Amino acid sequence: NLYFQGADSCIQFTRHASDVLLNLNRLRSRDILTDVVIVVSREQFRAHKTVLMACSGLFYSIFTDQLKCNLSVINLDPEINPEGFCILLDFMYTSRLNLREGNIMAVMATAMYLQMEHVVDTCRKFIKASE
């Protein structure tokens, strides 16, 4: 089946959470109900605020701030690597982190700035083994 009897007294759907994520990424690709532009240097990234808050400590702190919550444009540190930000934004919407020899230092730096501890620790483990 596509369902199971859960630990509690409830039916649970195995692929629902991943299907929601697939569909939110389809909304992103088509620029449907995106409500913010993240600007890193000269590059821009359109996204959904709630997805950003659900993945990053920094975006949650930003969009829970009463002054900043309704801003349509958010500028990040111009020192942040745009490729490293792109890889992380793609991870947020797909669960796949395209970690390579060339990008690993910039992805770790960006995830530290974005407060994405799971990705931060995973980068460290791959750096300790590649040494």
Ligand X SMILES: O=C(NCc1ccccn1)c1csc(Nc2ccccc2Cl)n1
Taking CB under 6 A as the criterion, the residue among 41, 94, 103, 115 binding ligand X is 115
Among residues 65 and 77, whose Cβ is nearest to a copy of itself?
A: 65
Out of 31, 33, 42, 67, the residue judged to bind a copy of itself by CB under 8 A? 33
| 3-state DSSP assignment of residue 11 | strand
Residue 78: DSSP 8-state: T
Sequence length of the chain is: 131
**Calpha distance 99→88 (Å, rounded):** 10
Binds a copy of itself by CB under 8 A, chosen from 92, 108, 111, 114: 92
Q: Give the position of tokens 């309704």.
A: 70
* Long-range contacts formed by 66-73: CB under 8 A, 24+ apart: 71/36, 72/35, 72/36, 72/37, 73/36, 73/37, 73/39
112 binds, among Cl ion, ligand X, a copy of itself, none (CB under 5 to 8 A by kind): none
Instruction: Answer yes or no whether residue 54 interacts with ligand X by CB under 6 A.
Output: yes
Tell me how far, at minimum, the Cβ of 78 lies from a copy of itself, in Å: 26
Residues that bind a copy of itself (CB under 8 A): 2-3, 6, 8, 10-13, 16-21, 23-24, 27, 32-33, 48-51, 53-55, 63-64, 69, 91-92, 95-99, 118, 122
